[PDB]
Amino acid sequence: MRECISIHVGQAGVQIGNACWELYCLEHGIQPDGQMPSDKTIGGGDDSFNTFFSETGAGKHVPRAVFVDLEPTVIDEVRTGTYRQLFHPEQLITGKEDAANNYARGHYTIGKEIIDLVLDRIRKLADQCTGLQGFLVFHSFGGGTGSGFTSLLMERLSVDYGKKSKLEFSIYPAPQVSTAVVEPYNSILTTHTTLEHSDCAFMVDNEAIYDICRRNLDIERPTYTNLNRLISQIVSSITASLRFDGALNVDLTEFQTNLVPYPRIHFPLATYAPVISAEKAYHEQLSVAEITNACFEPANQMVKCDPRHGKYMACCLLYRGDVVPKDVNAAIATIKTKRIQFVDWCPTGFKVGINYQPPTVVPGGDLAKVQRAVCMLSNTTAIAEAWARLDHKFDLMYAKRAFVHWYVGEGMEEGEFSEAREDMAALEKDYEEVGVDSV
């Protein structure tokens, strides 16, 4: 019951899926061959980790996951990598020609040739569920598959599964690791198309993750492997309530009630602490109060923006490890004085959850293994700054129609560009309206 199906789309989605599922296996004691010695119920069960893993008769714990890419290079590495025995071959779907950083190719030209197979394979996972809760879609904004194919898939999932919940992990583009000039186009197009099909989207700004790896982990030139191992820690904190059980554990959907005051205002800001190297964590234990105070330091946010210049509509703290409520309440009382402006229509309390399962690190990684960690999910108007930066780059290029011929040549019309941009303009205006005081 309460199963969750993960869908990893495109290079970014797939490679982040590698990091997350490896981390999950480490957290649950699952070996690269899917065997879990601590699991005594063979073939099935109703344990908390079964929301993310199905079980075979041979004792294999299989991710409830689908990996889809329009080219085979990235998923072939999964088919031959360390966890190749973890996935059944039909969960790894590849094409031959990618979308060439073109949203139109991912949504139409190339993506329409594989969408039926992908939906068929998703249906096979859903048929194994006794009470499917929803989907988690992992994708980049900037790539042609990550943007175009994800939009096509989200539209088709709404049809085939109704209003069943769909959550997104979206990679917001950063120039330090960007691979395409048209990424602002692909970003605006996929956001407009998915907006009414997504219930909750966690944006990850590559530049924010890049700066965190450089500043806190002392990595001179972070790679995707550096970024993805950090991203998986946040993803793990968010999903930990689904995969583990505990007396003080608060279900993610219960946070979601507080995080989404209106259907379109569904973009939580995520902040994670502590991100610290082994060298600095040695003989330096970070308390509940220290990691909580780091959640309000803007340099620890997953999206570059300034909540100090915005209003809060919700604040959720997701603790994991050695954490008791007495310390949390004390730490929160300190922050409410030294730091947090709410809109006048929303209660100012902080919603707290604690999973006592301690954090895990991947061997050979750069993160220190700490005794306690915290992910803050806040709903702040300041996240609209990330839409503004993206919409400004869109406007600069589109006013000259730069690169638009690559999209028209694949069947798109200029009307879709202006329609998508006007949706973003209304979205920015929506984030302003929710912050204005009542009359």
């Binding site: 139109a104 329409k112 096509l152 539209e155 709404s158 040549g409 694949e410 069947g411 798109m412 019309e413």
Partner: protein, 58 residues
């Protein structure tokens, strides 16, 4: 509860129709774009036949 069912079905219906509208409009535009490209290349072939014919008349 009847209203909740109707709202969910209307959402499914509107989404299925918008998507089919887009996929059909996109198929025609890309085919029209390719048909115009081939027609320009085929007019260059007709011009090549007139060049070789003009030389034959010299």
């Amino acid at each position: 509860i009847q209203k909740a069912i109707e709202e969910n079905n209307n959402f499914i219906k509107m989404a299925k129709e918008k998507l089919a509208q887009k996929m059909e409009s996109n198929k025609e535009n890309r085919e029209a774009h390719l048909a115009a490209m081939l027609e320009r290349l085929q007019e260059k072939d007709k011009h090549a036949e007139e060049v070789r014919k003009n030389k034959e008349l010299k």
